Amino acid sequence: KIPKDTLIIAVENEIARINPAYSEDHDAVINLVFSGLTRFDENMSLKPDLAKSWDISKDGLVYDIFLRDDVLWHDGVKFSADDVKFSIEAFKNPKNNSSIYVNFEDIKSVEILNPSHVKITLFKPYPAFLDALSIGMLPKHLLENENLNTSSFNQNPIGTGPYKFVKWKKGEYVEFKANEHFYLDKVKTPRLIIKHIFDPSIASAELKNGKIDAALIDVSLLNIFKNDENFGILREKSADYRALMFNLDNEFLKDLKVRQALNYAVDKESIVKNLLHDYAFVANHPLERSWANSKNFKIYKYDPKKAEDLLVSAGFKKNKDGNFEKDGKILEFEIWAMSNDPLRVSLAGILQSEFRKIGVVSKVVAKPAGSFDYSKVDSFLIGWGSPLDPDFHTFRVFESSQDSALNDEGWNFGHYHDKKVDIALQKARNTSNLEERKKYYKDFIDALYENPPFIFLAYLDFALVYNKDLKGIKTRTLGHHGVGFTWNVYEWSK
Numbered sequence: 001k002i003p004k005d006t007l008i009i010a011v012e013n014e015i016a017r018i019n020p021a022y023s024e025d026h027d028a029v030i031n032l033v034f035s036g037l038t039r040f041d042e043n044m045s046l047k048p049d050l051a052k053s054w055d056i057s058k059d060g061l062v063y064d065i066f067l068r069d070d071v072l073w074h075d076g077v078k079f080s081a082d083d084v085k086f087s088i089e090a091f092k093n094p095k096n097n098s099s100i101y102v103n104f105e106d107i108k109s110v111e112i113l114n115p116s117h118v119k120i121t122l123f124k125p126y127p128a129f130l131d132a133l134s135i136g137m138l139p140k141h142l143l144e145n146e147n148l149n150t151s152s153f154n155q156n157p158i159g160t161g162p163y164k165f166v167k168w169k170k171g172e173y174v175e176f177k178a179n180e181h182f183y184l185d186k187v188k189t190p191r192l193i194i195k196h197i198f199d200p201s202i203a204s205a206e207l208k209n210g211k212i213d214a215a216l217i218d219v220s221l222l223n224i225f226k227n228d229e230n231f232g233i234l235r236e237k238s239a240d241y242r243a244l245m246f247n248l249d250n251e252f253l254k255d256l257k258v259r260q261a262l263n264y265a266v267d268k269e270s271i272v273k274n275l276l277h278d279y280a281f282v283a284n285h286p287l288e289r290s291w292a293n294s295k296n297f298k299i300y301k302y303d304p305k306k307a308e309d310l311l312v313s314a315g316f317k318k319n320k321d322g323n324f325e326k327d328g329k330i331l332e333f334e335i336w337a338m339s340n341d342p343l344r345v346s347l348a349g350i351l352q353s354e355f356r357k358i359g360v361v362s363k364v365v366a367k368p369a370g371s372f373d374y375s376k377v378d379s380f381l382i383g384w385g386s387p388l389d390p391d392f393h394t395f396r397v398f399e400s401s402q403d404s405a406l407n408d409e410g411w412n413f414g415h416y417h418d419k420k421v422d423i424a425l426q427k428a429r430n431t432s433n434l435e436e437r438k439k440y441y442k443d444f445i446d447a448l449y450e451n452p453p454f455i456f457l458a459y460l461d462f463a464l465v466y467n468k469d470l471k472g473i474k475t476r477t478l479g480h481h482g483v484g485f486t487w488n489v490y491e492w493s494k
């Protein structure tokens with residue numbers, strides 16, 4: 001049995017470089033080792049962390065940030081303004097190829113005015129900046145002469161976070177020990193292990209045979225825990241959605257009428273009702289848990305007749321087999337799903353069924369996450385979503401310059417290029433006035449409807465399943481893959 005002083009938590013995704021500069025919002029380990037200037041509480045409220053306070057100028061261009069003087073890095077060295085300037089400059093240096101480059105490109109200058117005071121000046125307003133500064137700070141004294149891209153640091157990280165790095169068995173687990181000088185509070189469980197388990201049926205089994213203490217578990221597997229008193233189940237809300245990603249390079253899917261038709265073809269109400277057992281709600285756009293949600297937008301209602309009318313209009317005709325065809329080619333394409341994710345496999349199956357009903361042929365291809373290039377398939381059962389500022393999973397996902405065929409750190413895997421979307425997100429992220437921001441996000445949402453990059457399917461709840469001995473777990477609004485479910489792990493204990 002797992003000792004009382006050890007926490008073992010399963011997490012779906014890992015990261016090859018435990019370094020805030022390469023955060024892709026998929027891991028649970030950078031936030032153990034590192035901490036940022038700001039943080040969020042159970043209500044997703046912005047709170048001071050490494051920074052004690054801050055003032056922003058009326059024009060939104062200047063940030064005066066005041067730091068704690070009582071923080072140590074894991075190696076004993078004090079945390080100073082030196083680190084903060086090194087870090088922010090590090091994220092916006094193009095030679096570092098940072099995954100969060102777009103969160104810091106707008107910084108013009110970082111001035112250290114006293115050892116606990118930095119003055120950050122921006123080219124244009126970027127209200128998302130304080131959310132952005134929740135990213136971990138890096139240690140200047142260890143990395144200032146390093147190649148941030150390849151440094152051995154990335155596999156031996158030193159941070160200011162609640163947990164010190166111990167060892168790493170690649171592909172299997174990372175092991176940590178409590179930071180006994182953690183400025184924020186005392187870490188309760190001295191030993192913590194994050195186990196890499198990307199298939200929930202395997203996670204489920206390891207809960208049952210006592211190999212792990214906690215995991216997020218797909219709704220399809222919850223039945224074997226609902227009547228087991230040895231476990232609790234915490235339902236967590238999230239901003240995470242699932243969708244069909246259209247690859248716009250595909251000869252059929254590039255066509256606006258075809259993409260609209262495929263949207264009209266899917267009975268989303270039936271999916272959420274039946275597959276997801278109301279651990280989900282129907283999705284239509286990517287900001288429906290945001291303040292940025294326009295709440296009055298157009299949608300593609302389930303309408304098979306309209307789908308067919310659209311495909312006729314696009315020049316297709318049902319052949320003798322009942323399949324839409326144009327110029328000797330039937331309208332067909334592949335739908336790819338992560339085979340280790342039962343929800344996505346089920347969804348790819350349902351889409352294939354829905355399309356078949358209107359004479360669209362498709363092939364489901366299920367392969368393990370990480371084993372194929374998601375930007376090189378006709379379509380992909382994709383997911384994104386962040387409870388933080390609406391910029392964070394929209395700019396890298398939809399904007400043209402973030403097309404991943406051009407931008408190694410872009411998340412626009414479908415190669416989507418829309419002028420109204422580009423303009424809307426750019427204005428939205430660089431305007432200070434909240435009401436103005438909402439206006440631009442409405443333009444963005446409306447533009448997405450007119451030129452849909454996806455079929456949006458559903459927003460997910462997550463089920464945190466945990467050994468009943470576990471105390472201290474707090475919920476909050478999770479992100480994509482349920483990331484964030486370990487946000488207060490330093491308060492957890494047995």
Ligand SMILES: O=C([O-])C(=O)[O-]
Binds near residue numbers: 374382384
């Ligand atoms: O992050 C993604 O690409 C996903 O999970 O679909």
Ligand code: NI
Binds near residue numbers: 026383480481
């Ligand atoms: Ni993902």
